């Protein structure tokens, strides 16, 4: 039962159309709880979960100040990277930043993450030892030199082993009713004849939380991938998730195939057979 807290920032330049569009989102595991949009009228960090509204004005003022700072630094980074790659002002470019921390089922610190990307492409990242940086190209090398000079790694490690984990624990306790719950996947199977000699078996897992789930197909008890098809886990919209896995079988041999479901909300993984 590990948990995580994650902050995502996206900044998209709009040449000739004003300032860059900035969107920030905060997640605890698979639940979004804060949000900032530079095109919104509020100009403040806004709640997205009910358990974060307990925080007083000091928390929201501080959060709004830091999200403004992230917006400003991203805007400056856009022009800086435009200079690093000798790019003109005609093109629209995107800078993304993500950072956060993981804790185990004991809520002990596991790992911290801090990384950037430019135009959909990896740029710089904190290494696993939380002591150094990995640069994806030779401009990120200059960024890494700047960050090593300023000893950014130590301040970041202090944040990741301190404020990040402590406030993740605080949110998991204040939102205990929804962050620490586990919704088992409600499963069911569908049958559809595709021809006179073949059919399609689709097993569904619905209304589960968290999003991590495993759906596998077995024929005669052996893993099968030949005529199988899985969809990406998708949000239902009410806070839970959905997924299904299908397989094409010879009509009349449905009993040879089983669908195996693995999730945190189920003590024993489920086995679904058509009949």
């Amino acid at each position: 039962g590990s948990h995580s807290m994650r902050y995502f920032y996206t900044s998209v330049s709009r040449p000739g159309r004003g300032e860059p569009r900035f969107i920030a989102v905060g997640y605890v595991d698979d639940t979004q709880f804060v949000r900032f949009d530079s095109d919104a009228a509020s100009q403040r960090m806004e709640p997205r979960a009910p358990w974060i509204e307990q925080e007083g004005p000091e928390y929201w003022d501080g959060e709004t100040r830091k999200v403004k700072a992230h917006s400003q630094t991203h805007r400056v980074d856009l022009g800086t990277l435009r200079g690093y790659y000798n790019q003109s002002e005609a093109g629209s470019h995107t800078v993304q930043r993500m950072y956060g921390c993981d804790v185990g089922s004991d809520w002990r610190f596991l790992r911290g993450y801090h990384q950037y990307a430019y135009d959909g492409k990896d740029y710089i990242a904190l290494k696993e030892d939380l002591r150094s940086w990995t640069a994806a190209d030779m401009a990120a090398q200059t960024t890494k030199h700047k960050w090593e000079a300023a000893h950014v790694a130590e301040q970041l490690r202090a944040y990741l082993e301190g404020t990040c984990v402590e406030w993740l624990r605080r949110y998991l306790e204040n939102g205990k009713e929804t962050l620490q719950r586990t919704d088992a996947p409600k499963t069911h199977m569908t049958h559809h004849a595709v021809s006179d000699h073949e059919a399609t078996l689709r097993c569904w897992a619905l209304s589960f939380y968290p999003a991590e789930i495993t759906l596998t197909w077995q024929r005669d008890g052996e893993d099968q991938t030949q005529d199988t098809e899985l969809v990406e886990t998708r949000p239902a919209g009410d806070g839970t998730f959905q997924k299904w896995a299908a397989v094409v079988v010879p009509s009349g041999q449905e009993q040879r195939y089983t669908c195996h479901v693995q999730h945190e909300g189920l003590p024993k993984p489920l086995t679904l057979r058509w009949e």
Binding site: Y7, G26, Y59, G62, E63, K66, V67, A69, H70, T73, V76, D77, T80, L81, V95, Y99, Y116, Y123, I124, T143, K146, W147, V152, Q155, L156, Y159, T163, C164, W167
Partner: peptide, 9 residues
């Protein structure tokens, strides 16, 4: 809670 430092590429 977010990070305090004013970081630039």
């Amino acid at each position: 809670k977010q990070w305090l430092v004013w970081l630039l590429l």
